[PDB]
Amino acid sequence: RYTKEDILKGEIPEHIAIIMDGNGRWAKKRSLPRIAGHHEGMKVVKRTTKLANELGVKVLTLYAFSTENWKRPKMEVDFLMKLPEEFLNTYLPELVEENVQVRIIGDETALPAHTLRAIEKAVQDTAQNDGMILNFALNYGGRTEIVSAAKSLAEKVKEGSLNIEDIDESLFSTYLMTESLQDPELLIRTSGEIRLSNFMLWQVAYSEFVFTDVLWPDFKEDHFLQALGEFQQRGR
Amino acid sequence: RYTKEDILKGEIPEHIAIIMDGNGRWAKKRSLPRIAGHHEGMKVVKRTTKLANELGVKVLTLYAFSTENWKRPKMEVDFLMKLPEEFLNTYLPELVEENVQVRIIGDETALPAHTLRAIEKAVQDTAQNDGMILNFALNYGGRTEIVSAAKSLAEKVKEGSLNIEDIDESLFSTYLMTESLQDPELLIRTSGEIRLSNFMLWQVAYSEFVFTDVLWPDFKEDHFLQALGEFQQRGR
Ligand SMILES: Cc1cc(N2CCCCCC2)n2ncc(-c3ccc(F)cc3)c2n1
Ligand SMILES: Cc1cc(N2CCCCCC2)n2ncc(-c3ccc(F)cc3)c2n1
């Protein structure tokens, strides 16, 4: 068992990445509509964002909407696409006071313009902050990301701006959506699924993984600290 | 609890991939030199190869030697590099009778020529078999593999043989060392480590993962069947 000051004892991952799964199953379990659970999960986002920022986490990356989530019922998809506005309308000033930097990774051209408009004002309103980086992964997939790196590098070779022999691992990393950000030392996934689901495939080559049966809406600060306690046990 | 005929009831992954970790810790636990454990692990390879082939697994991919394993003591590295000869000198005729196809993925130019010579005769001696494919991952790393796909695609674009707009996900897959092989539906990792260690990063986008505390030399047929039982519980 762990509590907080025992966690500050040790290493705090500079970059944590979380697959926020299990919202539907949390609402189903309470005899609630699935959209209720998405809404509950929205609170745990900022509650987790605040705790990680006190601890000194420097990048928090949260998988909000997968490329494969487009296939869900249209009423749900449209509600999920309204959650960023609702989240920012509720928490953005708090995030400004907390020195947070809001950022987005994924293919944005596929979001409704009312969802994009709201996000981009968040990014600008927190641009000149230098605190913790809050990365929402929205319409994000690892294979797409890797292919678009290859296509970009290929296009520069085609134009003569890049020699093939200068393409190495580190150069490849800079054409990923994660840009120059450091790779996540710790990946957390809730809801009892033990898989990666096409999330950040390159970037978690060496990450530690922590899977929990806890559903995302139930993922309060002690579960989060316990996940950090696991991380500190991992060697080599 | 599961046994075999309960496993044939259900789906058998066409392609299983295993990270064979924990040989050193198994020898340490028995007050044995670490090279003893590598040697023990060599038996469990063919014992696992036989069981998977009866079950109808079509591709077995086993992570034998990682790119980062070069940094181990030189006496151990040289012994690990002698294991393929020893393994084939002991089991290759059995693998020929069993209709197996032996294949290798990784950067081979870095292996000693006595190790490469032995492997390549195995590959040729099983080339015209059409049974199960036994893939040893030897000097293999996912990031390197992805970069070399990008460099190959880039080189064809440079030469005019490939238009950039024809690079998509499926085309990208064909320039990976796994060629046209199907992705693994099931990934198994022994020794209690919960990470991917730069193994097959693209190819396990959607794979199910099963982690076990059992060390590889202790990974007998029931542990293997129990891992298959887990796999059959996984949905969506
Ligand atoms: C689609 C979606 C779903 C979403 N959920 C909240 C719980 C996670 C699981 C899905 C439901 N959340 N939570 C926050 C955002 C968000 C996105 C962009 C941004 F700039 C600020 C916040 C979000 N976006
Ligand atoms: C380096 C190494 C280590 C190795 N171990 C046996 C147990 C796995 C963990 C490392 C020790 N095994 N086991 C079989 C091979 C092999 C490689 C190529 C081939 F064509 C046929 C067999 C092997 N190669």
Q: CATH number of the domain that B23 lies in? A: 3.40.1180.10
Cβ–Cβ gap A194/B209 under 8 Å: yes
What Cα–Cα distance (Å) separates residue A93 from each residue in A118, B12, B88? 14, 52, 65
Chain A residues touching residue B146 (CB < 8 angstroms): 146, 172, 202
Residue in A144, A153, A193, A196 to test binding to B, most B beta-carbons within 10 Å: A196
CB B16 within 8 A of CB B57: yes
Smallest CA separation from ligand 2 atom 21, residue: B84
Method for structure elucidation:
X-ray
What is the rounded radius of gyration, in angstroms, for the C-alpha atoms of chain A?
18
List, as one string, the DSSP characters of A96-156. HHTT-EEEEES-GGGS-HHHHHHHHHHHHHTTT--S-EEEEEEEE-HHHHHHHHHHHHHHH
* Residue from A107, A138, A214 to probe ligand 1 pocket by mutation (most atoms less than 8 Å from CB): A138
User: For residue B195, what is the DSSP state?
Assistant: B
Rounded to the nearest angstrom, the distance between the alpha carbon of B86 and the centre of ligand 2 is: 9
CB B23 within 8 A of CB B214: no
- Active-site pick, A21, A53, A135, A139: A21
Instruction: Specify the number of domains making up chain A.
Output: 1
Q: The domain containing residue A214 runs over which residues?
A: 4-233
Strand B59-66 and strand B208-211: the pairing is unpaired
Chain B residues touching residue A25 (CB < 8 angstroms): none
The Cα B65–Cα A212 span in angstroms is 30
CB A216 within 8 A of CB A24: no
Nearest in space to B142 (alpha carbons), one of A236, A127, A18, A196:
A196
User: For residue B213, what is the DSSP state?
Assistant: S
The Cα B38–Cα B44 span in angstroms is 10
The Cα A62–Cα A188 span in angstroms is 10
